[PDB]
Amino acid sequence: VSPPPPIADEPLTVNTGIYLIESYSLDDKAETFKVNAFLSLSWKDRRLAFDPVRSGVRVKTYEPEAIWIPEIRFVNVENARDADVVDISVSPDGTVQYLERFSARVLSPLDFRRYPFDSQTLQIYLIVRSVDTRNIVLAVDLEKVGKNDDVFLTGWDIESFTAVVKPANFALEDRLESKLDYQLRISRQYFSYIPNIILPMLFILFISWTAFWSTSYEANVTLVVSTLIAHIAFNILVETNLPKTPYMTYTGAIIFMIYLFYFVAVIEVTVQHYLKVESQPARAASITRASRIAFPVVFLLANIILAFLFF
Amino acid sequence: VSPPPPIADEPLTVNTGIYLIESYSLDDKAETFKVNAFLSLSWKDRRLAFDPVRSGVRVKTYEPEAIWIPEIRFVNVENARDADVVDISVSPDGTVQYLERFSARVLSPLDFRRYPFDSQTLQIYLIVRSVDTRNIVLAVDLEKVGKNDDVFLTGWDIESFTAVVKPANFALEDRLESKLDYQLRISRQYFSYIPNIILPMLFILFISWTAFWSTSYEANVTLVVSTLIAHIAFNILVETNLPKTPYMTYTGAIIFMIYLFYFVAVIEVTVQHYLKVESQPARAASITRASRIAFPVVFLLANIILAFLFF
Amino acid sequence: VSPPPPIADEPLTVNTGIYLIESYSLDDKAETFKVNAFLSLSWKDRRLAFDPVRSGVRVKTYEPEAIWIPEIRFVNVENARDADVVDISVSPDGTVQYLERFSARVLSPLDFRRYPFDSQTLQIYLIVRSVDTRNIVLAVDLEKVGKNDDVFLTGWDIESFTAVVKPANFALEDRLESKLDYQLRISRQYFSYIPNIILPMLFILFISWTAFWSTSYEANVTLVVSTLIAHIAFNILVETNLPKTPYMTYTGAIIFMIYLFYFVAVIEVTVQHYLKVESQPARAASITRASRIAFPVVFLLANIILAFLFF
Amino acid sequence: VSPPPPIADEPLTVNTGIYLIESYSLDDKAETFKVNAFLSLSWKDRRLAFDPVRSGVRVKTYEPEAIWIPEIRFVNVENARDADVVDISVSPDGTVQYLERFSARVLSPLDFRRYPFDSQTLQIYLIVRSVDTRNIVLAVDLEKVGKNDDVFLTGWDIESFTAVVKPANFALEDRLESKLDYQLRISRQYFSYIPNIILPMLFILFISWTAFWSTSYEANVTLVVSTLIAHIAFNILVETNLPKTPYMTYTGAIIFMIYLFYFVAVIEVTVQHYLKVESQPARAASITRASRIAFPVVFLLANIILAFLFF
Amino acid sequence: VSPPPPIADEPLTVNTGIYLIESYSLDDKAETFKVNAFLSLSWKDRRLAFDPVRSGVRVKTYEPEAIWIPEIRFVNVENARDADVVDISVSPDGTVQYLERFSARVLSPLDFRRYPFDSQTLQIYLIVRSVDTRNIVLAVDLEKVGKNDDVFLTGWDIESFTAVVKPANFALEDRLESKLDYQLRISRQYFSYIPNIILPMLFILFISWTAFWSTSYEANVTLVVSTLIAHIAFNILVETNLPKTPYMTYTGAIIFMIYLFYFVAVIEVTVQHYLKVESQPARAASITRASRIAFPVVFLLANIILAFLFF
Ligand SMILES: [Cl-]
Ligand SMILES: [Cl-]
Ligand SMILES: [Cl-]
Ligand SMILES: [Cl-]
Ligand SMILES: [Cl-]
Ligand SMILES: [Cl-]
Ligand SMILES: [Cl-]
Ligand code: NA
Ligand code: NA
Ligand code: NA
Ligand code: NA
Ligand code: NA
Ligand code: NA
């Protein structure tokens, strides 16, 4: 089969739509999600036109093999989509109405700067390559763009599914390509991070500060080093659920800054002991009393400044 | 092939029946499960009718290619089901009796609020898309719905496998769709959680309370901080077998609350030492004696209130 | 093609055989194993009979497409088996001799009660569905049942591969089904559990009992709490190699019981200190002396009783 | 079909070009990467020549089945590439212009010596096997060699995508082979290694050196042994993201050397205590004072020498 | 198609050759490796013979479909190999020269007794099943056995790739089978085990022996118990990279024996304290002084004896 011939010198407009059935597996480390959806295509093929009076039928159904169908592909996919044709219908004027159900693993990068309080715009790019006989341009039929009410992405809130209606038309290996941008806007459910990571991490830090109400070097060393090791365990746990970013994340900044607090608590604990041994308990006392106020105050201001830079 | 033509203006009724052969791999984190079952379909095609006297045969067998078969799909699947046709039989009146054996990865959300004492209703949605010539409606043939007595879901108790007999008929991309709800009711085997997570977690907590019968600051600091770290290990272990929920789970609530007990034990241990050093052992004694009763009592009431809110 | 017609009213007997070449991937968590074997089928089709004098040939080879072949399936498989036909041979009388080499992931439940000293009977169920024209019954040809001398299941001892020669004949969706039970009997190689889990676990427990020869509360608290944490690490390690059972396992019982020993060692360590502080070292001395004998004795009797209940 | 016949004694030149659409999943442990690209092939087949007046078209399209296409393979792939033909265009001279979109898992060794500050040259080898009738030679059409502006390897900086234009022509099993080298030059984003591994590791080491300002053997033993265990956790974490190299890596060398510092800190802590007990606090004092300067100085020079050997 | 008919009563000799292109993913726990090679087959079929004078051609190319090809299989594979035919060439006498490029996951057991200083012989078994008309025997064409110089197995040294030229001819289900043994000889790159596991493990052990230069029970208990827990972490790490063997490995032996050293250090530490408390510091002194020499000496002799038994 050959593509539909033009009346003048106009390109062929293939009207597209995506309707999400199942959205799943957002892998933060891999920066990938899986999709199960309807892909609907529509174009005019004058060669397929018929008279509904003479033919009796108001619509004709065709097997993909019988008629010309445009080679439509996804750009940002891992492998070629698993697709199964559902229906092909032709109207009297020759307007073809194609529908397939597909499944694909989409590769769209994420912005972890505000993590776990981040929002994302997942991208799905549709593309068509022009043939030598005719140039093919993509279009968005908004009535056939959308999603199921049951569509759920675990640990995420699905905000919207829309399309950037104007295609990106460009040359690639001396042939025209028509790209379309479908956008899935989602926002992370930060809830569980609070009782599982944030609050346990602050509790261990506050436990280290009880060393400011103790003269016992041996006990202090145990308090600050034990809690420091539990902080290393949280840092390791957190970095396992994220990829290696060339920038700092919100949780990353807080986790890093808390090391400085532990490091300075060790210097305080050391200085206090050294002085007690040097028979200077009075000077050691002043530094400990100051630390009781200084540590929570510097922690609160530091966190305010960090939240300000990130939000 | 074309669909069966109607006598009047009635829709085509495709009678369905899923019979579970194998139920396996319920991944709590992914909220998916895998199924292996028989799918049976039955409809009338007057075009296939024959006289049993003239043809001799009482039933005719057909290859899927030879006759019209409705395009039946699962809604909440990851990818299209792996299916293999077992038999196609036609009765004199033209009643077709289709049977296939399939396997699919079903995606159905889980409610972790009462975990590990939760029960679920796993959903399996069957669907058919109406053609322009005729509208197709699904039906449940209850004589052909069921499961093998050997069907076993590891770590779960299979309660029932039933179907919501009235289909959800609705429009989707200007065509009628007929959805059916098959339900697999299961309940978690909470047994192993008791000797592996719940009881070890309570033992370490009770070990921390032995600090209320000790005047040794150094030993107390070791007791409470060590057990706190083992509690962090259990929290990390528990959260690895579950997804990130925008709500609190039963085990989650208990695990979180226990941090508050450890935090308050550290303040008690600190206060007791401070007083002993300030030459106030009498006041420190009263607080320690009170803690011996207060801690187990507040723990028991808190747990009663939590069980009440969750069950 | 149609099935072979009967002489009288007798069912068609399909003679079966399985010869294992490769057995691998016994996942204890998934309760699955993978197999690569020969499936041999044999039946009489009188329509295929020939005279060896007239035809010259003593045997005729057919492509699967050319002749009728029974639809044979495995019951307890995850997905349909990957099969490749090796040979199809027809004798003068019409006896067909089919042979294929297949690979499948078998789902057969395991009994972890005596773990890691358990033995299993892995099940492989072969099934055939009767057609409307004729009823098909399965049979075991013992000369074609067996296993390769190289067959090795990692961490397991392969005892036998046999077949329960009498099929389970039953009705399923108003048609006859003939099921056959092939059994692979295996026994776990418990060896490595001794130097890697059992002996390290007993060593840490015996190290905790050295607290019965110490008056140092601070050292005792370190001994019992440190070793308790190493016991938690072994419990976590052990439960990762097993699924969640609704019953107690041998290792499970021992691991759990050992927590009680640690809990009671903490009470002893606490009581001893309390008394020393109360200026009652004599009473504390009696309890410590008793613990030295009591702890290993109660541990030995408890373990004898447990081994008795489980073996 | 047979290959194109020569005019004289010249080999057939198949012009190639790879245009990267997606580059993802660079696994350091496996030394693999995944690619999604355009493969374009072009050759002359005079047997396909046509007159456009006669044909009614200026460019002919063929299905792969219809015409002779050279068997082009990748060398360093795990399995055969997943390819889908996009277009085949024949011009009146007989110039075939083939285009396919493929995806493959490329196996290429990585040099971890300077890790995590390493740069790589990923290799992609194209090959063609000569037939008995004609010898096939590969060529690079530079106008068809490029990469999409969005191509992003997570945790890596993509520097260039080029081709070594001169093929490696050689004998293999008495037939000519024409190999082409496509190179992807990338450089690791070392950023995250600094706040997640390097700085936490140095902080714990500096915490161990606070033992040089303490006379408390019990506290010192806790300081040096605790931090040593946290260093073991970092070493285990680091070696999990890398394969086993028969050479030393930069991070590997630093991680190893730091063990020597911990080992010598333990000897210092031991010597200091032994002397204090032997009533020689003066000698112990000199060694401790020297250690305060010696340890950071020897650490700084050692690191300078290491950076010098590796960069 | 039928197999080539015999002149006498001689079997058909199929000449084989494997040429490795890619050898990768040796997974110790699964005892598997993945291979990507060339499989070349050659046999005489007198029916395909031609006169080069009359036919003009010196060689004829055939599609697999057109001529008889022997069903060649691998024995020790997980699934059937992914193969793609490269070329089929026929010489005047009727000598067929087949060539395919395949990929397979080979299952060959490994001997971990000397681990990580082990060497292996990975075995690849080629097999052919004789038909009723003729018996098929395999042969090795040494000129077509070999490997690419770039072939690299990560963490392993490839020594040789050879074939056991005499096939194992045997009966299996009353038909002859001709097995061939292709051997890939490899030796582990033990290098990284030295700075990552062996040396860190010895350092922690030597740190435990500093307890022999301390009278401080509290410090000793910390030294020996802390280092014991780090030894448990190395044992857990090591056993994760290996399968469960019914025999002892070299690393396994050393790791196990080191537990005995820790156990005896705890008894020494306990005895020393008990004596000091019983006002017997002189007796405690003798035992401690002896332990300083005894422990490293018994460790050195034990290790010599172990290396001797294993190498
Ligand atoms: Cl696609
Ligand atoms: Cl489906
Ligand atoms: Cl099957
Ligand atoms: Cl390829
Ligand atoms: Cl094979
Ligand atoms: Cl034999
Ligand atoms: Cl034979
Ligand atoms: Na088409
Ligand atoms: Na059909
Ligand atoms: Na301590
Ligand atoms: Na057949
Ligand atoms: Na071709
Ligand atoms: Na053939």
Author numbering:
A (entry chain C), B (entry chain D), C (entry chain E), D (entry chain B), E (entry chain A): 5 to 315
Show sentences the authors wrote.
The basal principal (+) face, below Loop C, contains E82 and H127, along with a cluster of Asp/Glu residues found close to the TMD: D31, D32, and E35 from Loop 2, as well as D115 and D122 from Loop 7. Consistent with some of the previous studies of H127, H127N and Q both produce Wt-like currents. A structural analysis was performed on E26Q, E26A, E35Q, E35A, E67A, E75A, E82Q, E82A, D86A, D88N, D88A, H127N, E181A, and H277Q mutants, by solving their structure at pH 4. All structures were in the apparently open conformation. There are no significant differences, measured as 5-fold over Wt, seen in the backbone Cα residues of any of the resolved structures, with the exception of E35A and E82Q.
